Design a protein around this ligand. Structure first.
Ligand code: CL
Ligand code: CL
Lengths: 292, 290
């Protein structure tokens, strides 16, 4: 029964201004074994191979830049981009000599690194690796039309980006046994529809206005009532005309909040820190010792 | 007004995610906890912290999904932020704190303070979230936009597609002009993302029938190196395979020096998913001989 779990603590190293994730298990010394995945996978692909090797050797399995749990900087993600990031990853880890275990585009990276660093490679295990394919007749007939479409302008991006054809189509098509839903979800995870700007939209939809949404209205009314009764020392900064706290609200708070000091900061709307940070910071500093 | 952000990054793992935070000033004493709101980050506090750090530890987290913190798959409702900030505070082992809070950071800070009243030694606040009884009390110059933000479909087109909260509201809500350097700090966490670009670029780099020529030459070059190199080699292959069918495995057995070959049985391309135990155990048996 082939394992679906990924029982590996995350490790990250900063590389050319981004972070790359990697598996790092086994002893600390000896020759490390460096596992390189390809498209559209991650170190997840090695999850059931690493445990055979970890008892005797250090196992390092990075996620290529833009993949797995690695950062996704704004690159073209051409082969040369992957070369740069993997080169810097190996150097950031201070690796000397390695054994390579490589697959697909990770094999193009590994072989290219090995050719440039032959003294540092003690062995290469490889499988289903990138070699020059002399004609499309040498490409498997059952996947020829699809890969030709991937390489066809516009249509390739529709299939791979809009329809996720490489994860939903190629990946199970190129495994003989059936992948489970848990396994597909691990492969889907780095490429789900991005969170992106969701937090910025959800916040205004939570603002407590005219009783709605009711759960936030109740919670905010509760802490406003707490503030009205609490002896906690309070410091209010307000600007004019303000947004949430106009002058009239500042005066209401002066009437209603115990133990309140109020500072007017001058012109201000909502992000008062951008209009008079020096007064805000200096007044906080002056107020803090009075809290002893 | 300074535009730089001269604070070393710190990260802490919270509920499976990394949260970024500023941590400056003395390492002990009561800490001052700065909480930003929408659509900002610890960057909002960059010119206020230096007044406070001489006397007190200053901690300024980026809320989950914002700043340099991770972006897990959440709804990003208020309750999500409550959970991650609660766990952030406990992860740092904070006991008593002074709060300095703004906007949704004030809703988070006041709500935390009410639930933990023994641990709050003071609260500084500004432009904070309070119950707004009617839209009448929302300033007219921003009222239509916030009504639109809360309208189905329209609100997402504005905030997500057009970045209205960063490109519109943020400078609308500062009296002086924000500089482009400041705008770029505020834009950075929310730049249009990379997404699936690597998945499409890879098949367009495959060396097939000579193209693309730069990859063809590079791949030919390392294949020529492999054919002359004495390095120990171990090839796993399956049937029918994809890139390495049986006839190609046989050709490699003839042409590569110092090669051991292992047939794994049925296999196409991701052989690790069809026979991981044979691949892993054969690598383990092979490594001592190196
Ligand atoms: Cl908001
Ligand atoms: Cl590919």
């Amino acid at each position: 029964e082939i394992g679906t779990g990924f029982p590996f603590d995350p490790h990250y190293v900063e590389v050319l201004g981004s972070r790359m994730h990697y598996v790092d298990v086994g002893p600390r010394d000896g020759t490390p074994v460096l596992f390189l995945h390809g498209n559209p996978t991650s170190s997840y692909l090695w999850r059931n191979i690493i445990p055979h090797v970890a008892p005797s050797h250090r196992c390092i399995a990075p996620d290529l830049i833009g993949m797995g749990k690695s950062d996704k900087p704004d690159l073209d993600y051409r082969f040369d981009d992957h070369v740069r990031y993997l080169d810097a990853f190996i150097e950031a880890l201070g690796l000397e000599e390695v054994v390579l275990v490589i697959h697909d585009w990770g094999s193009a990276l590994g072989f290219h690194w090995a050719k440039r660093n032959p003294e540092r490679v003690k062995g290469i295990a490889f499988m289903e690796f990138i070699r020059p394919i002399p004609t499309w007749d040498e490409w498997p007939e059952f996947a020829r039309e699809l890969f030709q479409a991937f390489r066809t302008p516009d249509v390739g991006r529709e299939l791979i980006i809009d329809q996720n054809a490489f994860i939903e189509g190629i990946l199970p098509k190129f495994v003989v046994r059936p992948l489970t839903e848990v396994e597909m979800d691990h492969y889907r995870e780095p490429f789900l529809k991005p969170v992106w700007r969701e937090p910025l939209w959800r916040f205004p939809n939570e603002l407590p206005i005219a009783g709605e949404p009711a759960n936030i209205w109740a919670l905010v009314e509760a802490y406003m009532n707490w503030l009205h009764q609490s002896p906690v020392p309070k410091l209010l900064f307000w600007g004019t005309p303000g947004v949430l706290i106009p002058p009239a609200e500042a005066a209401r708070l002066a009437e209603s909040l115990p133990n309140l000091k109020t500072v007017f900061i001058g012109p201000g709307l909502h992000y008062l820190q951008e209009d008079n940070p020096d007064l805000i910071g200096s007044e906080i500093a002056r107020w803090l010792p009075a809290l002893h």
